[PDB]
Amino acid sequence: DQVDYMDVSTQQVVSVGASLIPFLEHDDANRALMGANMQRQAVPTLRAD
Amino acid sequence: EEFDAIKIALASPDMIRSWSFGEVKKPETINYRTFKPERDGLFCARIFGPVKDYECLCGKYKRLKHRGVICEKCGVEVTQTKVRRERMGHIELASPTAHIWFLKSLPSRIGLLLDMPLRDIERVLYFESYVVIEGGMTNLERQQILTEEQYLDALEEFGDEFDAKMGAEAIQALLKSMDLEQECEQLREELNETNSETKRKKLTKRIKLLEAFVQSGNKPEWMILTVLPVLPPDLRPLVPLDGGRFATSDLNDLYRRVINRNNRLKRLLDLAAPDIIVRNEKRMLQEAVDALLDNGRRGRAITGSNKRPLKSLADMIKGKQGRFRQNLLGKRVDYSGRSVITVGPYLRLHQCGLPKKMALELFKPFIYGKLELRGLATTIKAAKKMVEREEAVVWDILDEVIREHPVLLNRAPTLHRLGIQAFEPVLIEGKAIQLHPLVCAAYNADFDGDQMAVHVPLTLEAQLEARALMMSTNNILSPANGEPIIVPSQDVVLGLYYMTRDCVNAKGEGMVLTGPKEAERLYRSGLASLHARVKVRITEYEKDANGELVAKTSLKDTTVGRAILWMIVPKGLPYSIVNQALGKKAISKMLNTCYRILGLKPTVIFADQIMYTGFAYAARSGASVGIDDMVIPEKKHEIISEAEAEVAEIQEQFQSGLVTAGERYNKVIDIWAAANDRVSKAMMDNLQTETVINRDGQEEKQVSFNSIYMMADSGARGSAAQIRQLAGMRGLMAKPDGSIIETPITANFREGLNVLQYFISTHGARKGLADTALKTANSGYLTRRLVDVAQDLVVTEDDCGTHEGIMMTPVIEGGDVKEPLRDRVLGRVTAEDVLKPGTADILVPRNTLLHEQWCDLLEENSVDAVKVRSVVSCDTDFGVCAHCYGRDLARGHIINKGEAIGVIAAQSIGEPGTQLTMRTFHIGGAASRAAAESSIQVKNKGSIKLSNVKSVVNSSGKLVITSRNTELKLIDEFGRTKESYKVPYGAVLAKGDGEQVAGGETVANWDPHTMPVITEVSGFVRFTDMIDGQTITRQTDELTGLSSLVVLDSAERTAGGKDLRPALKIVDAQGNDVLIPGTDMPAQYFLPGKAIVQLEDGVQISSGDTLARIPQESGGTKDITGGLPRVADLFEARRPKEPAILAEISGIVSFGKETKGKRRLVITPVDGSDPYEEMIPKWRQLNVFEGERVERGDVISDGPEAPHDILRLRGVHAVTRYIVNEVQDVYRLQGVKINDKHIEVIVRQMLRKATIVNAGSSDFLEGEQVEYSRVKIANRELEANGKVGATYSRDLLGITKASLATESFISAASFQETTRVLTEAAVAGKRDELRGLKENVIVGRLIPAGTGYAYHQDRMRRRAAG
RNA sequence: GAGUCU
Ligand SMILES: [Mg+2]
Ligand SMILES: [Mg+2]
Ligand SMILES: [Zn+2]
Ligand SMILES: [Zn+2]
């Protein structure tokens, strides 16, 4: 009865970069940071897989 | 070109014109259409020279046909265009302008010399007020300022009777009129009567200047410039951008402002304009000259177009982007490249993969040289095209040049010398550098995209220097610590680990093999596991008393895999070395053993073979990482629910108001931190001994072959700490503050963190990565400070003939001995003849190396402490002797003459600071302190031996300690210290001093999160200066009403009770004071800030009761970041905020008079009847109880020691040991290995200078601090020839000051403070004779150390002979 | 100014 509100989605504390990391829940924050940063550096290939 | 030294002085107006080759009288540059030098412009050809080589402007005289011809038409000398960067110019300023560096650079120089305030001088410069230059009748005083109104007074009354003027002219005439000889005498003779501190300091500095001003040949006139020199054009170039746009230096823009205002001033003087107009122009001239020289110093810097300020001359000299730090103590280099590095696990340790096309561009001149020799190319242009076409013949010749021609490989950051290593190049197919895995530790190079720089040693000397010094195979041990840096990691450790370790039966258990080769036969044949227990015949060679190896054959019970590894093992090592299951720590000992037994060659081949087999058997193993490999204990949810209930209990007691906020904070962290230990011990117990296997007998168990376990147990990568986060519990996370978050993460990475657990984890993630970016530079700045002080120091002499050294007791600290005597004393000349216990036969000679052999004999006889020759005690003036330093830790043998120790020392200290700032920061997620030291448990039986302890017995019947620095020893049967602890203040001892204890006994017990104040007398409690609201506060509860009192400090205190000290006074039943047994001290314990008190006024107490409880909140996890500032402060020799007081002279104490609480000590020694008096603060409870035989350097106030007080009272060896122990304790907390000798090196540089007390027989006389080396060279001739002996005192210096105190001003201006160094050197007329390394690095000469050592001393005999 | 190795 004391509850007033609730988080809308499971994803809301995270960014767009970090939302695309699978199993982010099991990654240390420190490596997750670089992963989302390097995901941005990923050159697109000849065949989009 | 070659020369002896460089000298600095002020430029005379006359001297400025000598450098000039014409006056620039116009601010014009170039004609916009016909782009040429303008008529007497800033880029004039008539003044600075022609734009093309040997070509006048008009073009009448071309080429060398006209050699030294000055064209009559345009007026231009037919010379090289080289002359345009070399010839300078000048500007005849119509009016004098002050030189900002001899005005603003404090001390003011012009003001310090005039004894006239800078404010007063500036008023004269900007024409606010007149200054009297020479008041004819002394009605008007000299150097007295007159306002514009006050000038008008004297003008009507006196007129010519006084000469007061205004502007730079007035300060220059003021500097002209002053006599240096007459004023200097007067200052000497009138210092006699007063003699204070700051008068005698400033009046003596004025004498030093006046005398040095005379001896320098400088005039005070020249502080003000009448002539302004111009920089040569090519040094401030107007060149064309490819497009039509041009570009120019910011100096051209500042020169133009100066010339415009100077030419206009000449015009307004020509026009005899009113003075109001003329003054504005003279202010603007001062502003433009001051902006030219140093832009941002006098006022707001003049900005150009970009909004940024114009870069001045001073700016191209001063600091980081100045010539010194960027284009002179460091350079861009020919025959260099780089690329992304990648493994070469096939390579040998002396090799590296160098790409084809890289090596082709690198070695171009050597190919053109071979192509002409073999007769393939006629000329170089022809050879260039052969190489550009990449002909088949060229690859063969390239291949020829590179054989036996080494290449240097470098990584950023270059923290220590091993950051550069030489290899033999191997040409490879791809574009990526291949690096040898074993040298990866020195570079700190991982292959996740590191890049490395390539350099070609061109000259033969450089080929030999590369191969003899900097080759990878010569550089195995660390110069910081005598241990190998070349040590297998990762796959290699895991592979030898998998090989050696055994397993129950397995395939083919208890078999019997002919040799190590039949073991490889059964494994490759597929009949035995590497883990089968087997008897094998192995023949070990062990080395005899002489050089010869003795062969011994024996049946050995080992696994198949262990037999196979013996094949790698060279002959000379026992088989005992490969009989255990090998981890990283053991494999490092194998190469260290092998290095000391066999030599360099065997180790290099052994190290390689270990690498090869380690990788290959790691690959065989197929070791892997699955989610099931991360075993969680079944009892995790059990541990957490118990530990949750314990923490809920303190928070429920907090809501009641029983336990406070700070108490709960420390108390809750202890419960969670022991719960993390509980889950982790459960995890490692259900992980390590989890394999329960059936043998051919029935059933037993062994260590688990869980893949992750093997990886952390072998030490290949990860540790038990990391496995907690994986399988166990993540633990307490750190706040970005450093203080620990009260809610820890219960979960692990296998189970997954939830939304909040992640959010909490990110606090610690960001703060770690933050220190990797920011705090690295405080650490790297230490490296730099350390290097600049030790730079110049080199091994000069073989043996100094000094008898002295530092006594090294073993670091036995905190139960387990932290550093043996053996480790601390190894590779060091025995100072004194140090024999065995029974003093009836010498064991070790005085001037002799400590080899591992002699160090083992020290343990046999149990040598306790050993006096050892140190760098600090060396009596070499020039540098250090080889003996005092000892063994080169990197080489394992006596240090060579010529080796640069200063730099090696700085680097070893600096590097681990710097690299550890990046290490457990990227890798750090969590916090892991465990500072809950409740109770000492003694482990061996012993007699209890306390020292520096004064306890008092309490009502309970317990020995309570009332001394701060109490130590607890553990004395064995014969009577020697095994274990050592710190027993703190207000601690309860189980057994007092001398009593026997058993092993595993709590010998001491106390409360960690509180520092009690305990009494020494019994009776009642009195409240003194404890007024409510001013000094203390109060808070109460309900029905009955329990109130606690909380003492406010100066932060939470009003101005009313500032000079009131709050203290709990002891009294008896009557109401009178209670004397502390055997002393005239009425009992009074001073309570400090934040001190919580539960006993209120009028409460009966016994001796040993706790009066007040001072909070002890320190929940920061101490990483490199929290301890490094301590290191910096120690090396910089800072007194703390509260230095502990020490006795200056040995003798009988008598306490004296008092100043409203503040104590005096009129101590009158037995021999020295003359007294020494010193004031003491009120609140300092003293350790000494007066009237007692106190010696030099006895702790009177408890508290931290100034290193200054240590050196002053207890000599050099005392202060050296304070610095080494205090600094080294900080690196020992982090597990960093730095030999004591490296700290000793820098401490020697700190103990460089010395103040001369008694008069000499030169010109030291009194107060003048000079270097130690110099005063001793005088004392050598004085002790023999005679005359007045010079009494002395050695002084301590911080790094940053000792670096600036060096006589080489080029060393000083290259370190920091460039603006100040140059001006103080210019005024003294100092001459730098280029002594140290910095100086010769600057001039681009051979280092006067290392390989050039030989060469520099050969020039020095040419100088002596005639 | 946006990055890469520490
Ligand atoms: Mg790494
Ligand atoms: Mg890397
Ligand atoms: Zn001409
Ligand atoms: Zn010496």
Is residue B320 within 8 Å of residue B391, measured between CB atoms?
Answer: no
> Which nucleotide's C1' atom has the smallest distance to the CA of B448?
C5
The token pair at B846 is: 């005085």
- B445 C-alpha vs ligand 1 centroid, how far in Å? 6
Query: Determined by which method?
Result: X-ray
Question: Measuring from the CA of residue B449 to each C1', which nucleotide is nearest?
Answer: C5
Q: Consult the annotation and say whether B874 binds a ligand.
A: yes
What is the rounded distance in angstroms from the CA atom of residue B482 to the CA atom of residue B477?
6
Whether A41 sits with its Cβ under 7 A from any strand C atom: the answer reads: yes
Nearest-by-Cβ selection for A28 from B750, B759, B925: B925
Q: Are B922 and A33 in contact (CB < 8 Å)?
A: no
């000290």: which residue's tokens? B1061
Residues near ion ligand 1 (CB < 5 Å) are: B 446
The parent domain of residue B961 ranges over 934-1006
- Inter-chain touch A29–B925, beta carbons under 8 Å: yes
Paired tokens of B496 = 């030898």
Question: What values do phi and psi take at B556, rounded to 5?
Answer: -125, 130
Compute the distance between CA of residue B149 and CA of residue B158 in angstroms, rounded to an integer: 15
- Neighboring chain B residues of A35 at a CB cutoff of 8 Å: none
Distance, CA of B448 to C1' of C4, in Å: 11
Residue B979 belongs to domain with CATH number: 2.40.50.100
Strand C close to B1191 by CB, under 7 A: no
Resolution, angstroms, 1 dp: 3.8
B450 CA, C5 C1': Å apart? 5
> How far, in Å, CA of B650 to CA of B663, rounded?
10
Span from the CA of B1346 to the centroid of ligand 1 (angstroms):
32
For residues B1240 and B805, give the distance between their C-alpha atoms in angstroms, rounded to a whole number. 11
CA of B891 to the centre of ligand 2 (A): 29
Measured from Cα to the C1' atom, the residue closest to C2 is A41
Q: What residue ranges in B832-878 does DSSP mark as E strands?
A: 866-868
What is the edge-to-edge ordering of all strands in the sheet holding B951-953? B951-953, B959-961, B988-989, B1004-1005
Is the dihedral angle over the CA atoms B1128, B1134, B1137, B1141 positive or is it negative? positive
Ranges of H-type helices in B1229-1267: 1236-1246
Q: Which two tokens stand for residue B388?
A: 């550009």
Nucleotide closest to residue B915 (CA–C1'):
C6
Torsion of CA B712, B716, B722, B723, to 10 degrees: -30
Any B CB within 8 A of A23 CB: yes
DSSP-derived 3-state class of residue B1169: coil
Contact between B1240 and B872 under an 8 Å Cβ cutoff? The reply is yes
- Secondary structure letter of residue B1142 according to DSSP: B
Spatial distance between the Cα atoms of B722 and B714, rounded to a whole number of angstroms: 14
Residue B164: which H helix or E strand, with range? strand B164-165
Alpha helices in B333-487 (DSSP H): 356-362, 364-374, 380-388, 392-402, 440-443, 460-468
Distance CA B702, CA B893 (A): 44
Burial zone of B1031 (CB within 10 Å; 0-12 exposed, 13-18 middle, 19+ buried): buried
DSSP string for residues in B696-718: SSS-EE-----HHHHHHHTTSS-
DSSP-assigned states of every residue in B1272-1305: HHHHHHHHHH-S----EEE----HHHHHHTSS-H
Residue B1096 token pair:
């209120």
Measure the CA–CA gap between B800 and B873, rounded to whole angstroms: 10
| B824 φ/ψ angles, rounded to the nearest 5 degrees | -80, -30
Q: Which of B793, B585, B911 lies closest to B1243, judged by CA?
A: B793
Interatomic CA–C1' length for residue B769 and nucleotide C6, angstroms = 12
**Are the C-beta atoms of residues B750 and B726 closer than 8 Å to each other?**
yes
Token pair listed for B860: 């046999």
- According to DSSP, the β-strands at B351-355 and B420-428 are parallel
Q: Test B769 with A30 for CB contact under 8 angstroms.
A: yes
Q: What is the dihedral of CA B1337, B1341, B1346, B1351, to 10 degrees?
A: -160
Q: Tell me whether residues A10 and B755 touch, CB distance under 8 A.
A: yes
Which chain A residue lies closest to B752 (C-alpha atoms)? A26
- List CB contacts of B648: < 8 A, sequence separation 6 or more: none
Residues of B in contact with A29 (CB under 8 A): 758, 761-762, 764-766, 925
What is the distance of C-alpha B467 from the center of its chain? Answer: 30
Which residues in chain B have Cβ-Cβ distances shorter than 8 Å to A17?
none
Contact assignment for A26 to B922 by CB distance below 8 Å: no
Query: What phi and psi values does residue B1328 have, to the nearest 5 degrees?
Result: -90, 120
Whether B639 contacts B746, CB under 8 Å: no
B772 Cβ contacts chain C strand, under 7 Å = yes
Distance B37 CA to C6 C1' (A): 50
A49 touches chain B (CB under 8 A): no
Structure token digits, residue B1137 = 């905020």
3-state secondary structure of B504: coil
Q: Return the ∠ at Cα B1254 (arms to B1250 and B1260), rounded to 5°.
A: 60
B881 is in an annotated binding site: yes
Contact across the interface for B749 and A29, Cβ inside 8 Å: no
Q: Does A38 touch chain B (CB under 8 A)?
A: no
Do the beta carbons of residue B482 and residue B892 sit within 8 Å? yes
- Cα B989 to Cα B1118: distance, rounded to the nearest angstrom: 29
> Distance from the CA of B1347 to the center of ligand 4, in angstroms?
22
Contacts of A6 in chain B (CB under 8 A): none
In sequence order, which residues have a C-beta less than 8 Å from that of residue B1181 and are 6 or more positions away? Answer: B1085, B1086, B1198
Of A10, A13, A28, the CB nearest to B749: A28
What residues does B224 pair with on adjacent strands?
B98
All residues at 6 or more sequence positions from B1107 whose CB lies less than 8 Å from its CB, including other chains = B1012, B1013, B1014, B1015, B1021, B1064, B1085, B1087, B1093, B1095, B1101
Q: How far is A31 from chain B (nearest CA, A)?
A: 8
> What does the alpha-carbon distance between residue B1245 and residue B905 come to, in Å, rounded to a whole number?
11
- The residue written with tokens 């290949």 in the block is B716
CATH of the domain at B640: 1.10.132.30
Q: What is residue A45's DSSP assignment? A: P
Q: Is the CB of residue B145 less than 8 Å from the CB of residue B120?
A: yes
Query: Which amino acid type is present at position B570?
Result: P
Q: Which nucleotides of C are covered by protein (CB under 7 A)?
A: 3-6
Measured CA to CA, the distance from residue B745 to residue B766 in angstroms comes to 17
Taking the centre of ligand 1 as the mean of its atom positions, its distance from the CA of residue B451, in whole angstroms, is 13
Q: Is B594 annotated as a binding residue?
A: no
Looking at residue B982, its amino acid is K
Bridge partners of residue B551, in order along the sequence: B541
If you write DSSP's letter for every residue of B1074-1134 in order, what string do you get?
-B-TTSS-B-EEE--TT-EE-S-SS-EE-TT-EEEEE---------HHHHHHHHHHHHTT-
Instruction: Tell the residue number behind the tokens 């119509």, with chain if given.
Output: B94
CATH number of the domain at B1329, please: 1.10.150.390
- Protein B77 CA to nucleic acid C5 C1', in Å? 53
CA distances from B1162 to B502, B1000, B1081, B1171, B1184 (A): 75, 49, 18, 6, 14
Assess whether A37 (CB) lies less than 7 A from strand C: yes
**Inter-chain touch A29–B762, beta carbons under 8 Å:** yes
Closest CA to B408 of B345, B479, B449, B352: B352
User: What is the B909 CA–ligand 4 centroid distance (Å)?
Assistant: 22
Q: How far apart are CA B147 and CA B154, in angstroms?
A: 11
Q: Which residues, including other chains, have CB under 8 Å from residue B38's CB and lie 6 or more apart?
A: B26, B28, B29, B30, B31, B44
CA B541 to chain centre: 46
Closest of B698, B492, B443 to residue B613, by C-alpha:
B492
Measured in angstroms, how far is the CA atom of residue B828 from the centroid of ligand 4? Answer: 12
DSSP state of B1032: E
> Do residues B1255 and B1286 touch, judged by C-beta distance below 8 A?
yes
Token pair in block for residue B97: 């302008």
Residue type at position B86: E
Helix (H, G, I), strand (E, B) or coil at B951: strand
Contacts of B924 in chain A (CB under 8 A): 30
**Chain B residues near residue A9 by CB distance under 8 angstroms:** none
For residues B1136 and B1202, give the distance between their C-alpha atoms in angstroms, rounded to a whole number.
7
Q: Tally the residues of chain B.
A: 1362
> Which of the 8 DSSP states describes residue B234?
G
User: How far, in Å, CA of B897 to CA of B880, rounded?
Assistant: 9
Q: Is B938 exposed, middle or buried (0-12, 13-18, 19+ CB in 10 A)?
A: buried
The answer to whether strand C lies under 7 Å from the CB of residue B446 is yes
Closest to B631 (Cα-Cα) out of B666, B679, B670, B671: B679
Total count of residues recorded for chain A: 49
Question: DSSP secondary structure string, B1309-1348?
Answer: HHHS-HHHHHHHHHHHT-EE---SHHHHHHHT---SSGGG
Residues with Cβ < 8 Å from B717, sequence gap 6 or more?
B489, B490, B711
C-alpha distance from B1123 to closest chain A C-alpha (Å): 24
Residues with Cβ within 8 Å of B127's Cβ and at least 6 positions away in sequence, in order, are B166, B167, B279, B282, B283
**Could you write out the three-class secondary structure of B271-301?**
CCCCHHHHHHHHHHHHHHHHHHHCCCCCCCC
**Cα separation, B314 vs B827, whole angstroms:** 49
* Closest residue (Cα, C1') to C3: A41
Number of other CB atoms surrounding residue B14 within 10 Å: 9
Is B758 within 8 Å of A23 when comparing Cβ atoms? no
Sign of CA dihedral B678, B683, B686, B689: negative
Measured between alpha carbons, how far is residue B320 from residues B24, B227, B316, B1242, B1310 in Å?
32, 30, 9, 24, 9
